[PDB]
Ligand binder design. Sequence first.
Ligand SMILES: *[C@@H]1O[C@H](CO)[C@@H](O[C@@H]2O[C@H](CO)[C@@H](O)[C@H](O)[C@H]2NC(C)=O)[C@H](O)[C@H]1NC(C)=O
Ligand SMILES: *[C@@H]1O[C@H](CO)[C@@H](O[C@@H]2O[C@H](CO)[C@@H](O)[C@H](O)[C@H]2NC(C)=O)[C@H](O)[C@H]1NC(C)=O
Ligand SMILES: [Cu+2]
Ligand SMILES: [Cu+2]
Ligand SMILES: [Cu+2]
Ligand SMILES: [Cu+2]
Length: 497
Amino acid sequence: AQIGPVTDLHITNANISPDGFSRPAVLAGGTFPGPTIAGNTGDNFQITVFNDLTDPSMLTDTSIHWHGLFQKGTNWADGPAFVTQCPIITGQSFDYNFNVPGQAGTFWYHSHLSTQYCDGLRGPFVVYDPNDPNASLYDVDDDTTIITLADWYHTLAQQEPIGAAITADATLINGLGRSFTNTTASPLSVITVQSGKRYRMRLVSISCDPNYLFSIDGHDMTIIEVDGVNSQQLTVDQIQIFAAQRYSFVLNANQPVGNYWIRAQPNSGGQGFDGGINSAILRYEGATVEDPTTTAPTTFSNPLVETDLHPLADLGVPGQPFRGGADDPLVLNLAFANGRFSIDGVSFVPPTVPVLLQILSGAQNAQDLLPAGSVISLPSNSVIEVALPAGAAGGPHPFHLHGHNFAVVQSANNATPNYVNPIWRDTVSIGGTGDNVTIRFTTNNPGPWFLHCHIDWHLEAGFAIVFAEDIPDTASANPVPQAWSDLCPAYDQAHNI
Ligand SMILES: *[C@@H]1O[C@H](CO)[C@@H](O[C@@H]2O[C@H](CO)[C@@H](O)[C@H](O)[C@H]2NC(C)=O)[C@H](O)[C@H]1NC(C)=O
Ligand SMILES: *[C@@H]1O[C@H](CO)[C@@H](O[C@@H]2O[C@H](CO)[C@@H](O)[C@H](O)[C@H]2NC(C)=O)[C@H](O)[C@H]1NC(C)=O
Ligand SMILES: [Cu+2]
Ligand SMILES: [Cu+2]
Ligand SMILES: [Cu+2]
Ligand SMILES: [Cu+2]
């Protein structure tokens, strides 16, 4: 069952074997993925997170981010460790108490301390719309229509050796899948549909790294939502989904009663589907309980191309219709060398005092904020443009901005900008060498908002900056509860800082 919008959430260690190989993990709600947190648009969420972690190999501190929720007036509840809070220490709990005005769609939650989400603390987060403009396009939308895609590692995140390449050992679809090496015939996930019905499939990438080529043999997929933003209907037969992105698509159960492969091919790790890796099963009611016998095409006829997506609503684009046509036009220099990423020449290393606390204590220019060179001020009530030219090793990099969604004025692999009707989203691939992926948004949400690559191994290696939006208004706009004020003293005492 779904939990929320008011719930406890216990964070524990346990052994799991989602691909037949047992290892310890960091879990929310006792499971991988964690339970779905849900409510309706505008609801008050109060998620009281109980840190019960005891195994130091995966860190006993934690902090949870609610990915894609704007947190307007509640920056303290956003979750990124050392940006908006100190971590919760073991044996303690913390109420993330926030509201979701003006948002409805498919989100997720994850640890936002170090690489801890890779060790298992990840789950879906759905905000339903009782008056959804897409409601008539489908019949079923519930916990059984959520599809998570996850990378899974046999080596613990903190134990990945410095200097060796990191790749996953399995793809998990709804928490199950088979290992790339030493493959055993462990159980595959089954998604069940009834012939003649239409389903709102909520596709969530909870990946720490790979992008997936997602498809369903025999079926096509009509996109209706992108990262929380309702879209015009776009029919595709394959979706390339990057880390942390979400799509809703209508699945019409219009093929013969049977079994069909669900495919999620990562860009690294095991290639293909031998032994049932990278696979799940779409089973119609009344079908034989047996594996599919379907195949993929050699070439997909209608792959998703991001420039084909358009908002359902008339969202437009803020600013003027040319490069640099914004109040605050930025171009970030994104680089990698010698094991570390940098933005504008500075590699992100989390500060001792969280950025929000530094602001509330009176640091009021971004040159005064630590880490030096990693915090950039944005002016209030202004159009911001951020160009993110690709080329840094380890791509394609999916960049994500907290506190906001944004218009994607220029997408990967296409040099033409769109100042008329591009999709809005919150995580975007910046593409390949020579690309100039560019985003725009307006600053109506005071607080420090993280901007980073959502490949968690790259974040850890410094691929991040903080946008301190409207520093002068941050304190008045974000009143903090006593429990939040208690976090840093408790953390610093427990760690002798
Ligand atoms: C990506 O687009 C930005 C503008 O959004 C380009 O930025 C300009 O860069 C040149 C030097 O390369 C400067 O002289 C300009 O002041 C910048 N801003 C403008 C023209 O608006 C950037 O060059 C583009 N990058 C790539 C790799 O195409
Ligand atoms: C490259 O991106 C551009 C801009 O998003 C796409 O151009 C649009 O194409 C649509 C569909 O034909 C037209 O309605 C628009 O008027 C175009 N806008 C602009 C500004 O040119 C283009 O289709 C993309 N290229 C590919 C191959 O998908
Ligand atoms: Cu996220
Ligand atoms: Cu986020
Ligand atoms: Cu990256
Ligand atoms: Cu983040």
